[PDB]
Amino acid sequence: LMGGFGLKNPPPQILIKNTPVPANPPAEFSATKFASFITQYSTGQVSVEIEWELQKENSKRWNPEVQYTSNYAKSANVDFTVDNNGLYTEPRPIGTRYLTRPL
Amino acid sequence: LMGGFGLKNPPPQILIKNTPVPANPPAEFSATKFASFITQYSTGQVSVEIEWELQKENSKRWNPEVQYTSNYAKSANVDFTVDNNGLYTEPRPIGTRYLTRPL
């Protein structure tokens, strides 16, 4: 209901964890669980590649369609860009429904 | 300078004429040119087929382009349509320059 593709078998959850690295243990054995660890974290790169199939528009409509367009007029910023502080923003929601089809 | 494709050898001129059909000549010979003809005209269909080659847009631009679009708001007529008397009209000139390229 929030929109998109209902899947019986969706893309799987991908789970990641830093492996615990104990700190120095005591010199005599204790059966108590280790509470003492070397503080650490991890970083890397992730890539996602998705192939999408397209359904082409077959229309015989004579007159021009409504299209999504950026405003041609001047402004202080460009839509869907960073500002002078480096903050990327999205000016508005963009749906998918522009082209038309007979009912 | 009015725009378009300069051609050394353009599409040729296609010339058409109704063939003259004399009216009834006099019963004695005259060498004078016929001035008297059966009035007629012609009608038919004409087809023109042009193949156009396209140059695709390769851009890496991140933000959306300016696009030609029809206005989404309501109005009394639809652009590029006939009116209630059957008169087809063109609301405005449409150029070709919307997509962008680096210089």
Side-chain angles (χ1 to χ4, degrees):
Chain A
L1 292 175
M2 295 189 286
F5 302 93
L7 303 178
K8 301 296 285 184
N9 296 287
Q13 286 173 321
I14 301 164
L15 298 160
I16 188 168
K17 187 184 76 176
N18 290 333
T19 301
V21 176
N24 54 338
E28 292 83 359
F29 172 78
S30 178
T32 301
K33 180 179 74 177
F34 277 94
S36 180
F37 298 95
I38 293 170
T39 297
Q40 61 184 21
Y41 71 95
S42 62
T43 186
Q45 281 82 20
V46 60
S47 290
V48 182
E49 181 183 3
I50 296 173
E51 184 178 4
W52 303 89
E53 184 179 2
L54 300 174
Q55 187 176 358
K56 299 301 179 181
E57 167 269 335
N58 197 32
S59 176
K60 296 296 286 187
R61 166 168 171 155
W62 179 261
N63 67 48
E65 294 292 330
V66 175
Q67 303 290 316
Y68 178 81
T69 186
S70 65
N71 188 343
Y72 67 92
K74 65 178 177 181
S75 63
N77 295 335
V78 179
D79 287 343
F80 296 97
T81 307
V82 298
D83 60 10
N84 58 30
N85 295 133
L87 178 63
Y88 179 77
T89 58
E90 289 170 341
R92 66 182 62 84
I94 302 172
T96 56
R97 292 172 178 166
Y98 288 89
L99 298 176
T100 57
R101 183 197 290 271
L103 178 60
Chain B
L1 292 175
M2 295 189 286
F5 302 93
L7 303 178
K8 301 296 285 184
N9 296 286
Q13 286 173 321
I14 301 164
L15 298 160
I16 188 168
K17 187 184 76 176
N18 290 333
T19 301
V21 176
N24 54 338
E28 291 83 359
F29 171 78
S30 178
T32 301
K33 180 179 74 177
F34 277 94
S36 180
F37 298 95
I38 293 170
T39 297
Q40 61 184 21
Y41 71 95
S42 62
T43 186
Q45 281 82 20
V46 60
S47 290
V48 182
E49 181 183 3
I50 296 173
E51 184 178 4
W52 303 89
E53 184 179 2
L54 300 174
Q55 187 176 358
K56 299 301 179 181
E57 167 269 335
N58 197 32
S59 176
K60 296 296 285 187
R61 166 168 171 155
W62 179 261
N63 67 48
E65 294 292 330
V66 175
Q67 303 290 316
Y68 178 81
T69 186
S70 65
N71 188 343
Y72 67 92
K74 65 178 177 181
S75 63
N77 295 335
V78 179
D79 287 343
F80 296 97
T81 307
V82 298
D83 60 10
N84 58 30
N85 295 133
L87 178 63
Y88 179 77
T89 58
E90 289 170 341
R92 66 182 62 84
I94 302 172
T96 56
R97 292 172 178 166
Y98 288 89
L99 298 176
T100 57
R101 183 197 290 271
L103 178 60

